[PDB]
């Protein structure tokens, strides 16, 4: 497992394309970490990261839409629990 915190601000966008969906047994796995962005500029948000919780939101029982909704309206610090699949 893993734990990454992406602070908002800076640039603005989060740069992060998650790929998966609770309708296919997939803990929302990142497939594209845009560069020059919070996720790719926090030395942790790297592709192959199955998120299971965003800001204390256990996404394990959430669909790909419930996971992107949190990343869309995150708080000052985007604490994202990740399951690296390297």
């Amino acid at each position: 497992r893993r734990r990454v915190t992406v602070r908002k601000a800076d640039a603005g966008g989060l740069g992060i394309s998650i790929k998966g969906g609770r309708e296919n047994k997939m803990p929302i796995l990142i497939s594209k970490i845009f560069k020059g962005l919070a996720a790719d500029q926090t030395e942790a948000l790297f592709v192959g990261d199955a998120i299971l919780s965003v800001n204390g939101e256990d996404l394990s029982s959430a669909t790909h839409d419930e996971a992107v909704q949190a990343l869309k309206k995150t708080g000052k610090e985007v604490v994202l629990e990740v399951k690296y699949m390297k």
Binding site: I18, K19, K32, D65
Partner: peptide, 5 residues
Amino acid sequence: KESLV
């Protein structure tokens, strides 16, 4: 599903 936040 491939979104982009």
